[PDB]
Design a protein around this ligand. Structure first.
Ligand SMILES: O=c1ccn([C@@H]2O[C@@H]3COP(=O)(O)O[C@H]3[C@H]2O)c(=O)[nH]1
Ligand SMILES: O=c1ccn([C@@H]2O[C@@H]3COP(=O)(O)O[C@H]3[C@H]2O)c(=O)[nH]1
Ligand SMILES: O=c1ccn([C@@H]2O[C@@H]3COP(=O)(O)O[C@H]3[C@H]2O)c(=O)[nH]1
Ligand SMILES: O=c1ccn([C@@H]2O[C@@H]3COP(=O)(O)O[C@H]3[C@H]2O)c(=O)[nH]1
Lengths: 201, 199, 201, 199
């Protein structure tokens, strides 16, 4: 209803914005396709909806909303239910298109990504490409070690991801410190592959 | 008028959201019941409204609105009207449904709760249940001690509660440091019952 | 136009809010009278208007908007034009009604007030009442000394004031440090009256 | 469409505000001219729009939108495309009218400015004027040195400028510390001209 009307009205705005800034045709279609895949014809002010509720309802919703991600992520498959719930309530749903550089090597990293659906290539200067898909995560090394992105990460298909900010990452880890090790273990394997023998983890 | 219509429009938007996210029907009904009890057909941007006023008017409005809560609460009984006002200004209104766990034993606590109307059960592994009702509060132990929750608290009825965050709690206690003692006395008696001591 | 329509629509909301919370009749009329005196039938999103402009236009507007206050305040009558402009751009216009306690003794003070128009009584426990009016300011002692309100301040008439927050106060004073003395001088006179011989100033 | 109407509705609201505050007619016309040049009949919540997108799309859009600025600016000439993107992401678009003092000698500086289109005069007490135009920047000295503005800068034409705050400047320079040198070199040459040295 109004959710569809909000999609339509906001897409209208986007169109006007693009025409005003004279974006080329190919990019306008890309933006079109992004809205369609990201929102599917509906837009909600989720933060204001969830804000209207209480903690327990909010908990149940984030838990059900992220059921697919939870299922496919062994980090989550197995864990303490309060840890999961704390993680989930901080995640931000993001959609990426084929070709997008989600992460650029050498930049400073402020977030990590969990793959619900899609395929990404990890491109490290100095090494071969490798691929990550459903139930993998990436970007954890900068959150753990606060240095620079050790590789680029590029979407190969439409990717539905959930991002976590560094500050949120540390908020959750200060509460469930025993869970840090799980990230670190994955991080050490990846650092080993790219020739960083790394004690900090 | 527009506030009844704002409720109507908002609840349709919630229905649309639940359908999009494919939530199960009984959850959908749970959510419908929550809105009915929480908002009772009307919605307001209270932040926008209050923010259009001045301090004296907001103070007056908060005291008036919480006059029943305040009279029910022994904490406010002997108390400085400025401490009362400081507290009220910082409370967030919340409603819970029967069987909701407001608090879970073992988790980290960031808020405490005052009861305006309803009954809750305090569920402590290792001890008998106890009930709390109108004008008591709970959840204060982790705000004082920064430990884990010592008990679960479950809504037995519909509960209308006002929550106070740990940051606001400290702020107002920084301001009225004589009032910390009242909370400590209660906390101490409940720690005694569950066989705990804390220096 | 829409400014009047926004007043009317927002006053409607207020009315609904009050009926819902069952406020008594006398207080509803007080709120009515407040809207009428504060807004005069018009409402603007000033922050969004001023946000649309640039610095120089913004400067000219705050300067003209506060012409009356500037005129009647010797602190301002005389001062460096950049200091004034910096002060003005931080002030918040507030209206108070006869009987209002603007400030309560013993509380912690986070703002001071400049009187554009109106009369206030300063009520110190332990001393006689005194009055302040157009071109006076009050509440400066807590901003300077960060302790407790040394007296209550109650509106006797409709008062049109401009408030300044402590953080804004210090922001401006870190830039124009030579202006602090002016507040301190007034503060010392008032502290003397209420029996606080005070070196901190 | 709605963005043309948003301009119309917004400008009526500005007219209402100016009438309420009793601003003089020529100021009222000044403000009318500013809106015409700044917004050119359309208004958008760019924050809301961009915020609906993702990082890759916002990056693409910012680079596309600033392609002329970037090509005009020698600072970006040899530069890492990630440093360029970091900077662009932090710029705020601003327009000034002829005779506006963008900066006043002697005041405290919190921002610097890049010129996309227009000419400014640099007015230094004690020295001859100089002009700056498309692709130069100014106001960088106080961002580096945290002193007072060493000169006034006045708009001679309509000026379309992008501003960068001191906090954002440091943030991006924290990230690309090799780029600080470029700003220093310019700053040093301008300090030389006004007979100043700084260790
Ligand atoms: O051989 C490798 C090297 C790295 N990576 C990922 O790429 C990410 C880039 O950002 P980051 O450096 O914050 O985290 C990195 C890892 O998650 C990988 O999966 N396999
Ligand atoms: O015997 C008992 C034990 C506990 N309680 C309450 O349950 C609360 C759970 O969270 P918390 O640990 O921060 O605070 C606790 C108290 O407010 C109680 O009333 N009686
Ligand atoms: O004899 C007196 C005593 C005090 N006062 C004012 O009352 C104010 C109360 O708040 P404050 O303590 O932050 O600042 C105080 C002064 O500005 C006054 O005008 N005359
Ligand atoms: O001879 C001169 C002197 C100065 N300037 C510029 O004017 C600016 C004024 O503010 P600021 O002091 O932060 O930075 C200064 C420079 O960018 C210049 O281009 N040539």
């Amino acid at each position: 209803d109004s959710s569809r009307r909000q999609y339509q009205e906001k897409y209208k705005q986007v169109e006007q914005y693009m025409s005003f800034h004279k974006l080329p045709a190919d990019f306008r279609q890309k933006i079109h396709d992004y809205y369609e895949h990201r929102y599917q014809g509906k837009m909600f002010d989720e933060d204001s909806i969830l804000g209207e509720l209480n903690g327990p309802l909010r908990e149940e919703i984030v838990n059900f909303n992220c059921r697919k991600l939870v299922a496919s992520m062994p980090l989550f498959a197995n864990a303490d239910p309060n840890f999961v719930t704390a993680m989930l309530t901080k995640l931000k749903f993001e959609v990426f298109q084929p070709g997008d550089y989600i992460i650029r090597e050498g930049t400073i990293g402020k977030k990590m990504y969990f793959i619900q659906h899609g395929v990404v290539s990890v491109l490290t200067k100095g090494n071969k490409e490798m691929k990550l898909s459903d139930g993998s995560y990436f970007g954890e090394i900068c959150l753990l070690t606060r240095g620079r992105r050790t590789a680029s990460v590029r979407a190969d298909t439409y990717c539905r991801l959930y991002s976590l900010s560094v500050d949120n990452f540390n908020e959750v880890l200060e509460e469930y410190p025993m869970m840090r090790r799980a990230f670190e273990t994955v991080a050490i394997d990846r650092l080993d592959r790219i020739g960083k023998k790394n004690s900090i983890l």
